[PDB]
Design an enzyme around this catalytic site. Structure first.
Site, PDB file in Angstrom:
ATOM      1  N   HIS A 118       0.807  -1.215   0.000  1.00  0.00           N
ATOM      2  CA  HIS A 118       0.000   0.000   0.000  1.00  0.00           C
ATOM      3  C   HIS A 118       0.843   1.270   0.000  1.00  0.00           C
ATOM      4  O   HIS A 118       0.292   2.346  -0.245  1.00  0.00           O
ATOM      5  CB  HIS A 118      -0.944   0.056   1.215  1.00  0.00           C
ATOM      6  CG  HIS A 118      -1.990  -1.014   1.225  1.00  0.00           C
ATOM      7  ND1 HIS A 118      -2.836  -1.236   0.157  1.00  0.00           N
ATOM      8  CD2 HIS A 118      -2.346  -1.907   2.182  1.00  0.00           C
ATOM      9  CE1 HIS A 118      -3.643  -2.244   0.441  1.00  0.00           C
ATOM     10  NE2 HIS A 118      -3.373  -2.663   1.668  1.00  0.00           N
TER      11      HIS A 118
ATOM     12  N   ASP B 235      -2.292 -10.801  -1.868  1.00  0.00           N
ATOM     13  CA  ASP B 235      -2.932 -10.172  -0.727  1.00  0.00           C
ATOM     14  C   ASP B 235      -4.371  -9.814  -1.101  1.00  0.00           C
ATOM     15  O   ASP B 235      -4.679  -9.544  -2.266  1.00  0.00           O
ATOM     16  CB  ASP B 235      -2.125  -8.936  -0.325  1.00  0.00           C
ATOM     17  CG  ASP B 235      -2.577  -8.341   0.987  1.00  0.00           C
ATOM     18  OD1 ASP B 235      -3.603  -7.631   0.990  1.00  0.00           O
ATOM     19  OD2 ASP B 235      -1.887  -8.561   2.015  1.00  0.00           O
TER      20      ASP B 235
ATOM     21  N   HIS C  34      -6.107  -7.308  -0.548  1.00  0.00           N
ATOM     22  CA  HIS C  34      -6.285  -5.912  -0.904  1.00  0.00           C
ATOM     23  C   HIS C  34      -5.457  -5.557  -2.132  1.00  0.00           C
ATOM     24  O   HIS C  34      -4.409  -6.154  -2.396  1.00  0.00           O
ATOM     25  CB  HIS C  34      -5.909  -4.984   0.256  1.00  0.00           C
ATOM     26  CG  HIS C  34      -6.651  -5.274   1.522  1.00  0.00           C
ATOM     27  ND1 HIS C  34      -6.136  -6.064   2.529  1.00  0.00           N
ATOM     28  CD2 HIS C  34      -7.901  -4.928   1.916  1.00  0.00           C
ATOM     29  CE1 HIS C  34      -7.023  -6.164   3.504  1.00  0.00           C
ATOM     30  NE2 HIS C  34      -8.104  -5.487   3.157  1.00  0.00           N
TER      31      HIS C  34
ATOM     32  N   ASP D 110      -4.249 -12.463   3.925  1.00  0.00           N
ATOM     33  CA  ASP D 110      -5.534 -12.063   4.476  1.00  0.00           C
ATOM     34  C   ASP D 110      -6.709 -12.437   3.582  1.00  0.00           C
ATOM     35  O   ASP D 110      -7.853 -12.094   3.910  1.00  0.00           O
ATOM     36  CB  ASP D 110      -5.573 -10.558   4.775  1.00  0.00           C
ATOM     37  CG  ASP D 110      -4.925  -9.723   3.704  1.00  0.00           C
ATOM     38  OD1 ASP D 110      -4.630 -10.235   2.603  1.00  0.00           O
ATOM     39  OD2 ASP D 110      -4.706  -8.534   3.973  1.00  0.00           O
TER      40      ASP D 110
ATOM     41  N   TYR E 118      -3.749 -11.626   8.952  1.00  0.00           N
ATOM     42  CA  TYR E 118      -3.883 -11.240  10.345  1.00  0.00           C
ATOM     43  C   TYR E 118      -4.403 -12.324  11.271  1.00  0.00           C
ATOM     44  O   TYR E 118      -4.356 -12.126  12.486  1.00  0.00           O
ATOM     45  CB  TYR E 118      -4.777  -9.992  10.453  1.00  0.00           C
ATOM     46  CG  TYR E 118      -4.263  -8.950   9.516  1.00  0.00           C
ATOM     47  CD1 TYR E 118      -3.107  -8.221   9.826  1.00  0.00           C
ATOM     48  CD2 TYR E 118      -4.862  -8.753   8.282  1.00  0.00           C
ATOM     49  CE1 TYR E 118      -2.594  -7.287   8.941  1.00  0.00           C
ATOM     50  CE2 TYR E 118      -4.350  -7.832   7.387  1.00  0.00           C
ATOM     51  CZ  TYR E 118      -3.229  -7.102   7.722  1.00  0.00           C
ATOM     52  OH  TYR E 118      -2.740  -6.202   6.818  1.00  0.00           O
TER      53      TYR E 118
HETATM   54  O1  LIG Z   1      -5.035  -5.375   5.563  1.00  0.00           O
HETATM   55  C1  LIG Z   1      -4.857  -4.294   5.061  1.00  0.00           C
HETATM   56  N1  LIG Z   1      -3.965  -4.133   3.945  1.00  0.00           N
HETATM   57  N2  LIG Z   1      -3.281  -5.251   3.380  1.00  0.00           N
HETATM   58  C2  LIG Z   1      -1.881  -5.372   3.619  1.00  0.00           C
HETATM   59  O2  LIG Z   1      -1.277  -6.258   3.133  1.00  0.00           O
HETATM   60  C3  LIG Z   1      -1.188  -4.342   4.501  1.00  0.00           C
HETATM   61  F1  LIG Z   1      -0.724  -4.991   5.595  1.00  0.00           F
HETATM   62  F2  LIG Z   1      -0.125  -3.890   3.793  1.00  0.00           F
HETATM   63  C4  LIG Z   1      -5.548  -3.017   5.591  1.00  0.00           C
HETATM   64  C5  LIG Z   1      -4.881  -1.789   5.595  1.00  0.00           C
HETATM   65  N3  LIG Z   1      -5.551  -0.723   6.082  1.00  0.00           N
HETATM   66  C6  LIG Z   1      -6.796  -0.874   6.542  1.00  0.00           C
HETATM   67  N4  LIG Z   1      -7.569   0.272   7.105  1.00  0.00           N
HETATM   68  C7  LIG Z   1      -8.748  -0.018   7.907  1.00  0.00           C
HETATM   69  C8  LIG Z   1      -8.385  -0.799   9.206  1.00  0.00           C
HETATM   70  C9  LIG Z   1      -7.325  -0.350  10.029  1.00  0.00           C
HETATM   71  C10 LIG Z   1      -6.992  -1.043  11.189  1.00  0.00           C
HETATM   72  C11 LIG Z   1      -7.707  -2.180  11.546  1.00  0.00           C
HETATM   73  C12 LIG Z   1      -8.763  -2.628  10.729  1.00  0.00           C
HETATM   74  C13 LIG Z   1      -9.088  -1.929   9.559  1.00  0.00           C
HETATM   75  N5  LIG Z   1      -7.422  -2.043   6.544  1.00  0.00           N
HETATM   76  C14 LIG Z   1      -6.849  -3.139   6.073  1.00  0.00           C
HETATM   77  K   LIG Z   2      -3.780  -7.994  -4.251  1.00  0.00           K
HETATM   78 ZN   LIG Z   3      -4.196  -6.950   2.793  1.00  0.00          ZN
END
Ligand SMILES: O=C(NNC(=O)C(F)F)c1cnc(NCc2ccccc2)nc1
Ligand SMILES: [K+]
Ligand SMILES: [Zn+2]
Ligand SMILES: [K+]
Length: 356
Positions: free
Chosen positions: A133, A171, A173, A264, A304
């Site tokens: 990200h 991933d 996302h 995830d 996670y």
């Molecule tokens: O999982 C994610 N991104 N995927 C990856 O790999 C990263 F690790 F690089 C992710 C990133 N930001 C967010 N914001 C919202 C939120 C913040 C805190 C708790 C729960 C939700 N959510 C999900």
């Molecule tokens: K991806």
């Molecule tokens: Zn992710």
């Protein structure tokens, strides 16, 4: 036929001082490491040392301003740290964050160097904080610097500038940072599978849709496979690899494969809502090993559920070590929307990839 592994416990020092239970936990990397030990995978790997990325290396993908700001956080008081973190989308910062991010990047550079010089055939990097990200000029979504994007540029810097690097980002996302960094680049093919929901899923941007195929010289070298309306799992990911990822990748003929290997999308993850199994991840890995003469580097991104990511990434390493793929469950018929997503990408990229 050697598999490299890098893991350094110093990378757990990055922590959330106001929310110690934030899902991007220090023990994400130590739990993956432990599971490699108890599965007796660790002793089968060649241990690759971690190192700090240099600021010059960071500049391969990131602006000097962004580097300076994250660097300055090492000497910040908590009030500065909380306020700076809140300037980004979904970032926490501690005094150790910068160093941990340097170690994550440098760990991957060393692994890429080991692959490219033939010291190892492939490698796995158990690193945090994650990277995909992170943008040229800003931090985002638990990431400070874009480790995978940096490793692709580092790889080209020790080979030739036009070295063909494939980044597969599984991933759950979208790797907004990685897409942007290489959006105009035809030497780094970016392929991301991600939960999209018509843009109603983090990072919440229509940049992740299938019609963003790249720009300028990079047209055709950005492949978004976006999932809508459905708890996707092994059948959908197998189908995407069969119809899209593998044919495009083979045509591209990468000389190095980087996996932005977030876990995830795994069954049990508290954020992704998907059900890719550890054996699904093994098959995805086994398939990527048929590219680039087996030169594959698996880089930890998100994921996670500590148990899910530990088993899932251990199974990828098992494939890297040459073990036979475990058997998948009987593959149910694709969710209808998944077929729609795959057809949308096929129509978007048939102009650029004759194998489609
Ligand atoms: O999982 C994610 N991104 N995927 C990856 O790999 C990263 F690790 F690089 C992710 C990133 N930001 C967010 N914001 C919202 C939120 C913040 C805190 C708790 C729960 C939700 N959510 C999900
Ligand atoms: K991806
Ligand atoms: Zn992710
Ligand atoms: K690209």
């Amino acid at each position: 036929p050697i598999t490299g592994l890098v893991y350094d416990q110093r990378m757990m020092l990055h922590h959330n001082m106001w929310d110690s239970h934030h899902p991007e936990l220090p023990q994400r990397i130590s739990r993956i490491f432990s599971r490699h030990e108890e599965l007796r995978l660790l002793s089968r790997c060649h241990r690759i040392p971690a190192r700090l990325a240099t600021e010059e290396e960071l500049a391969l993908c990131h602006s000097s301003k962004h580097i300076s700001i994250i660097k300055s956080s090492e000497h910040m008081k908590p009030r500065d740290l909380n306020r700076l973190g809140d300037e980004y989308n979904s970032i926490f910062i501690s005094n150790e964050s910068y160093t941990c991010a340097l170690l994550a990047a440098g760990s991957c550079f060393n692994s890429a160097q080991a692959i490219l010089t033939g010291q190892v055939r492939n490698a796995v990097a158990i690193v945090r904080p994650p990277g995909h990200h992170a943008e040229k000029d800003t931090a985002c979504g638990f990431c400070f610097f874009n480790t995978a994007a940096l490793t692709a540029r580092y790889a080209q810097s020790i080979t030739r500038e036009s070295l063909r690097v494939l980044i597969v980002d599984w991933d759950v996302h979208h790797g907004n940072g990685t897409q942007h960094i290489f959006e105009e680049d035809d030497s780094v093919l970016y392929i991301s599978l991600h939960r999209y929901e018509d843009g109603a899923f983090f990072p919440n941007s229509e940049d992740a849709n299938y019609d963003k195929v790249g720009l300028g010289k990079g047209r055709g070298y950005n492949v978004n496979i976006p999932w809508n309306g459905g708890k996707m799992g092994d059948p959908e990911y197998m189908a995407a690899f069969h119809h899209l990822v593998m044919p495009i990748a083979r045509e591209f003929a990468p000389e190095l494969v980087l996996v932005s290997a977030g876990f995830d999308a795994a069954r049990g993850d508290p954020l992704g809502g998907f059900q890719v199994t550890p054996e699904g991840y093994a098959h995805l890995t086994h398939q990527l090993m048929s590219l680039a003469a087996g030169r594959v580097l698996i880089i930890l991104e998100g994921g996670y559920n500590l148990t899910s990511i530990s088993e899932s990434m251990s199974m990828c390493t098992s494939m890297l070590l040459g073990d036979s793929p475990p058997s998948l469950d009987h593959l149910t018929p694709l969710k209808t929307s998944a077929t729609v997503s795959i057809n949308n990408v096929l129509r978007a990229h048939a102009p650029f990839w004759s194998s489609l």
